[PDB]
Amino acid sequence: TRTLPPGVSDERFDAALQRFRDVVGDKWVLSTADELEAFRDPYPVGAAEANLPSAVVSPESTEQVQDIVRIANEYGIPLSPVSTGKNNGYGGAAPRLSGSVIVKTGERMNRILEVNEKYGYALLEPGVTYFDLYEYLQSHDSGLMLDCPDLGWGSVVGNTLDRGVGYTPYGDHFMWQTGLEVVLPQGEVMRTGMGALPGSDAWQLFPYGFGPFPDGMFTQSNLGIVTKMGIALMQRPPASQSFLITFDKEEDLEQIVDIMLPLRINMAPLQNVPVLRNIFMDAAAVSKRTEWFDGDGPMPAEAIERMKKDLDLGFWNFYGTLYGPPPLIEMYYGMIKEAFGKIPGARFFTHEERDDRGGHVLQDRHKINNGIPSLDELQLLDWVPNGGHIGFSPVSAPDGREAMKQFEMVRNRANEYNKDYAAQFIIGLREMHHVCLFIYDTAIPEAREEILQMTKVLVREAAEAGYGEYRTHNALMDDVMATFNWGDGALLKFHEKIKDALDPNGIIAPGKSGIWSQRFRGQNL
Amino acid sequence: TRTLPPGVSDERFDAALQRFRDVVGDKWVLSTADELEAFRDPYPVGAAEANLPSAVVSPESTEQVQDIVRIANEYGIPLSPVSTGKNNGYGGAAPRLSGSVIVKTGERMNRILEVNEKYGYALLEPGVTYFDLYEYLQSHDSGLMLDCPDLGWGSVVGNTLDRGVGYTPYGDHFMWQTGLEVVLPQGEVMRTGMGALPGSDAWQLFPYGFGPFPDGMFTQSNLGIVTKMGIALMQRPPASQSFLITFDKEEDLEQIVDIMLPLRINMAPLQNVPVLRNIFMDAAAVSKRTEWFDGDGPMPAEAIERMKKDLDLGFWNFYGTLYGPPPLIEMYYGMIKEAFGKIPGARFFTHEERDDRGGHVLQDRHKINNGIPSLDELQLLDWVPNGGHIGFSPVSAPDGREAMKQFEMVRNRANEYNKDYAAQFIIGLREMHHVCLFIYDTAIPEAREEILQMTKVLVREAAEAGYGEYRTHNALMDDVMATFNWGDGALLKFHEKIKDALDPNGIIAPGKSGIWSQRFRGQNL
Ligand SMILES: *Cc1cc2c(cc1C)nc1c(=O)[nH]c(=O)nc-1n2C[C@H](O)[C@H](O)[C@H](O)COP(=O)(O)OP(=O)(O)OC[C@H]1O[C@@H](n2cnc3c(N)ncnc32)[C@H](O)[C@@H]1O
Ligand SMILES: *Cc1cc2c(cc1C)nc1c(=O)[nH]c(=O)nc-1n2C[C@H](O)[C@H](O)[C@H](O)COP(=O)(O)OP(=O)(O)OC[C@H]1O[C@@H](n2cnc3c(N)ncnc32)[C@H](O)[C@@H]1O
Ligand SMILES: COc1cc(C=O)ccc1O
Ligand SMILES: COc1cc(C=O)ccc1O
């Protein structure tokens, strides 16, 4: 059947599309089941179909975003903005609420507006991918580097707006975000920070402006459609050196993290954002599962040994990168070797030393950590046929007991539901994003529902232990937000109150982060 | 003439007062003419009496704060929260709306809830001063250091919630803020970040939590009353060295800023937040105006030169600090010598190299830049009888040309109105806070009036030229917010719609940052 928006008839919906076409042109509104199949979640979760868009609209400018919002308010059409819509692992381009219209801001609004070499910033529209920006910086002989995620096909803006992470010293994307322009839910356009001051050259220079600081309210949020965003760019250092440390035992995690913290807290000698990847995660980047095991259920421990042997890796695999003058790189590599040396069976490789099949990730990290975007990590999805992943992304203290507790908790449930648990601890100064990627066969209905059931259990099992997620899939947003329920759900009530006063007709991305407008609360979609 | 909240009678006010005492006890409700004397703006601005409190309420817990708020909603009585109320230069403790009740949270809410050595953070009630925290740290033989402003009598929370700044690498106080508890305008209580998840250890570990990140909206804000705040604390480095560079000419400014930027933008070799102070700023810290020129008018150049000659200082004076093992310090001081030694007349000193009187400022910077709080900059108020200051604090791009244009513009008005211009450029990564202190006799009502009218001119002339203020005085709050009027005042309409959703009855510090709730809009207050 035709996907229509909640409470909107065929007749009123065809009026609504015609008006979108008036604004953007007829080629830039997509409305047929065929055309829309490309905007389904590529990695669907649950057996029952969900998150189905009713149309895709691609505006060329801010002026058109506004007119689209107005139309959507007049007609009661929920809108779900994206940049490039590559939020794979969290829903793709697919909207939380079935029947929403996707506003793909990145199709046509993809200009790099300014890259200022002197102040080390860039002003970007939301269609600028990491590749685009990288390509610009190469062409103009730039002395700046971008900070990217594992996959560079996503948007600098879109990724920042979901508080994604990268791996250079500028890994925390939202921290370095500086000013933004946004269309609010009734059509008004606003600029934050020093951009509210007309004629200011400080919009990308000073983030805060004057009065309350609102920029975070437009992250993981449905409070507006962002049309421009600035971001600081780090200077390319004179030299770098990436390294791998392999650790043999699963139980080495505790000690790894406890040794790490005093070296990370000060941003030296661990200058970048280290990553501790388990063997399923590294194996999956270079090989298929049927190369190690072709039986049923959890990979047995002898098969885990073959992966570690052939590829010459540990169960745990620490990847890091150092930057600066060559005498500094060596001092710091020296300190790191001394500390992690304690762990029996720890082995060290720099990016110069290792160039085999197992080294393919080290070589990939050394690109990423030097702000060169890659698609090498797409190979992960060939672990099994019709491969897809979901992100279960709890936050952990930089404490080996907490991490070992989370690891065992997750593994206990991943084996119970027959899913392989690829693990990647991404390590900040004071906390760790514990990304648990469960890779699975998207074709099979039972694999998908087991993924959904399994992750619903872990959200609740994690919350009961005091752990929360930093980011989650469409299908888990209500469940995740339901865990942030201190003071009788105070945080949610606050968010719903702001939502209702900026978005009286409940128009922008309803359900995002479990925040629904008055008119959807209680309906269970 | 007895001060009362707008449209509240003597008896309705009496009953409210009585209810406040029920909540907090008798001792902690001040309401008599000269009890409240101490809560007037200590550096009054304008000849007319503005900014008059009707009462002061000192609660001891979050619960009393919630109740006080509920009672204020019942009566329509404005509340003006402070921490320690030492916001001098901007209004001190005094409220923006005359008739509001001060809620001095810090008087009894002054516990250091936790200092964690492992993860390098603190959890604090509003009453912890920088002296108190430093005393905790000395007692416990801590590895951590704080980041303090010029005057350490203020609160860690108060300063942070006004987006204040200190001078260690952790200088940007708001960015090292992590997690807070807040009472919202109708008495609901809410924890931000991971604090919203019952039993999390991660409140002071991961700031963002999940979904929209609101912490920024409680800074320069009137959206709640803050009861707890977390802040990250830097590790104390093994050694340190501070340095003064003097630049003899007034014109060297342009060249000093242009050389500074590449040495600062990557936090190395300028690691700390450098300051560029003029001779006026530094003289007043060590001497009275009458030592150099007894006279009604602006200070002649021959008096400027004697100041420089006796104190052995330049017109522009550059104060920085280096941290790390002694080899790294020698390296980085090396590079700083060679870069700023391009400027003619420029002379260098370290903290070991000066015991004279002009050097007392360097010794005060060497404490502050190492997180040793101080009150030496109080001597600044001696400069003239009954000294007070006000802060006009424009943001500048870290560009020499833009820093001379702001300097001359400000100097011209300083001379026209007969006020001395003390200047300190506080230098971030990509921006500068250009802080202009104008010192004056607060007893003379013409001088108070010259100040208000002068800064009113300055705010308007600075915005015409493309510059906004980071922070401002009660006096200037409406005028500063009118300058950020991009999009037909798009920013202010936004802040008001949010204010009016969370505070239907217009209770919390109305007028703060030029943001007035519905019941006060379009009025002369
Ligand atoms: C499968 C996978 C995913 C992945 C990864 C590795 C693998 C194998 N590694 C990642 C990493 O290192 N870091 C990271 O942050 N994410 C990683 N992912 C997940 C994901 O693919 C990436 O984050 C990707 O960059 C996100 O997609 P994109 O960049 O295209 O973002 P989007 O889909 O357009 O938007 C994301 C959400 O933000 C809100 N949004 C976006 N644009 C707007 C505008 N203009 N206005 C308002 N809100 C906006 C929407 O909620 C949108 O869904
Ligand atoms: C005269 C002067 C001032 C000064 C300075 C040097 C001199 C000679 N140097 C400064 C510096 O180096 N850095 C800096 O940030 N400020 C400097 N100043 C200005 C001032 O002295 C300090 O900022 C001072 O520490 C601030 O005072 P305090 O810490 O006591 O904060 P407060 O007066 O209580 O309140 C500040 C404002 O924040 C909001 N606020 C405060 N508490 C709350 C709660 N609990 N809830 C909600 N909002 C709150 C209020 O708006 C309040 O006015
Ligand atoms: C599934 O989403 C994520 C994936 C990764 C790396 O593979 C890092 C952070 C994420 O949020
Ligand atoms: C009164 O305002 C300020 C004063 C100072 C003095 O060093 C620094 C920052 C400020 O905002």
Each domain of chain B, given as residue ranges in start order, spans 1-110, 111-237, 238-470, 471-525
Point out the ligand 2 atom lying closest to the alpha carbon of residue B150. Answer: 12
In words, the CATH class of domain A111-237 is: alpha beta
Domain A238-470 has CATH 3.40.190.10: no
B212/A265 touch (CB, cutoff 8 Å), yes or no? no
* Contact (CB, 8 A) for A506 and A520: yes
Contact status of B209 with chain A (Cβ, < 8 Å): yes
Residue B153's SS3 state is coil
Locus of tokens 């690691």: B271
- Residues B267 and B273: their CA atoms lie apart, in Å, by 9
Contact status of A327 with chain B (Cβ, < 8 Å): no
- Residues B345 and B330: their CA atoms lie apart, in Å, by 23
What experiment produced this structure? X-ray
* Contact (CB, 8 A) for B462 and B472: no
Of A195, A209, A232, the CB nearest to B430: A232
**Max Cα-Cα span within chain A:** 71
Q: Chain B residue with minimal CA distance to A204?
A: B430
- Residues B240 and B169: their CA atoms lie apart, in Å, by 13
Token pair, residue A64, equals 């058109």
- Which distant-in-sequence residues (6+ apart) come within 8 Å of B366 by Cβ? B240, B242, B321, B351
- Beta carbon of B471 within 6 Å of any ligand 4 atom: yes
B90 has catalytic annotation: yes
Of A198, A463, A497, the CB nearest to B501: A497
Alpha carbon distances (Å) from B424 to B258, B276, B299, B401: 16, 5, 19, 16
Encode burial over A475-487: b for 16+ CB neighbours within 10 A, e otherwise: bbbbbbbebbebe
- Please give the distance of CA B289 from its chain centroid, rounded to a whole number: 25
Locus of tokens 């700083």: B336
Token pair, residue B435, equals 């802080």
- Cβ-count burial of A260 within 10 angstroms (0-12 exposed, 13-18 middle, 19+ buried)? buried
Locus of tokens 């095991």: A293
- Residues A193 and A198: their CA atoms lie apart, in Å, by 11
Per-residue HEC secondary structure of A341-403 comes to: CCCCCCEEEECCCCCCCCCHHHHHHHHHCCCCCCCHHHHHHHCCCCEEEEEECEEECCCHHHH
B417 has catalytic annotation: no
DSSP B29: E
* Contact (CB, 8 A) for B145 and B257: no
Beta strands in A197-311 (DSSP E): 225-232, 234-235, 240-247, 275-278
Residue A497 labeled ligand binder: no
Closest CA of chain B from A470, distance in Å? 5
- Would you state the torsion angle of the CA atoms of residues A460, A465, A467, A472, taken in this order, to the nearest 10 degrees? -10
- Residues A443 and B290: their CA atoms lie apart, in Å, by 86
Of B121, B212, B470, the CB nearest to A216: B212
- Which distant-in-sequence residues (6+ apart) come within 8 Å of A412 by Cβ? none
Of A347, A388, A376, A357, which is closest to residue A291 (Cα–Cα)?
Answer: A357
* Contact (CB, 8 A) for A45 and A138: no
A210/B484 touch (CB, cutoff 8 Å), yes or no? yes
- Residues A115 and A144: their CA atoms lie apart, in Å, by 9
Contact status of A466 with chain B (Cβ, < 8 Å): yes
- Beta carbon of B391 within 6 Å of any ligand 4 atom: yes
Locus of tokens 């709730």: B517
- Domain B471-525 is classified in which CATH homologous superfamily? Vanillyl-alcohol Oxidase; Chain A, domain 4 (1.10.45.10)
Of B165, B154, B163, B160, which is closest to residue B130 (Cα–Cα)?
Answer: B154
Contact status of B482 with chain A (Cβ, < 8 Å): no
Residue B130's SS3 state is helix
Alpha carbon distances (Å) from A317 to A276, A308, A525: 5, 11, 42
- Please give the distance of CA B140 from its chain centroid, rounded to a whole number: 28
- Residues B51 and B41: their CA atoms lie apart, in Å, by 7
* Contact (CB, 8 A) for B225 and B106: no
Instruction: Compute the Cα dihedral for A458, A464, A466, A468 and give only its sign.
Output: positive
A264 phi/psi in degrees, rounded to 5: -100, -45
- Breaks in chain A (C to N over 2.5 Å), named by the residue before each, are none
How far the first Cα of chain A sits from its last, in Å, is 18
Strands A420-427 and A432-441: antiparallel
Q: What is the DSSP string of B322-377?
A: EESSHHHHHHHHHHHHHHHTTSTT-EEEETTS--SSTTHHHHHHHHHTTT----GG
- Residues B379 and B419: their CA atoms lie apart, in Å, by 18
**Answer CATH for A1-110 from 3.40.50.150, 3.30.43.10, 3.40.50.460, 3.10.129.10:** 3.30.43.10
Could you count the other beta carbons within 10 Å of the beta carbon of residue A48? 9
Contacts of B206 in chain A (CB under 8 A): 395, 428, 430-431, 470
- Beta carbon of A151 within 6 Å of any ligand 1 atom: yes
Token pair, residue B380, equals 């600044």
Question: Kind and range of the H or E element at A321?
Answer: strand A316-323
Of A83, A161, A63, which is closest to residue A127 (Cα–Cα)?
Answer: A83
Contact status of B147 with chain A (Cβ, < 8 Å): no
Q: What is the resolution of this structure in A?
A: 2.6
Contacts of B480 in chain A (CB under 8 A): 210
- Please give the distance of CA A146 from its chain centroid, rounded to a whole number: 16
Residues across chain A:
525
Contacts of A484 in chain B (CB under 8 A): 196-197, 209-211
Instruction: Give Rg (Cα) of chain B.
Output: 23
Closest CA of chain B from A198, distance in Å? 5
Q: What is the DSSP string of B172-237?
A: BTTTTEEEEEEE-TTS-EEE-GGGGSTT-S-TTT-S--SSS--GGGGSS--S-EEEEEEEE-EEPP
Contact status of B463 with chain A (Cβ, < 8 Å): yes
Residue A471 labeled ligand binder: yes
Locus of tokens 């104008």: B438
- Beta carbon of A222 within 6 Å of any ligand 1 atom: no
Question: Kind and range of the H or E element at A157?
Answer: helix A156-161
How far the first Cα of chain B sits from its last, in Å, is 18
Beta strands in B428-511 (DSSP E): 432-441
* Contact (CB, 8 A) for B83 and B158: yes
- Residues B230 and B125: their CA atoms lie apart, in Å, by 9
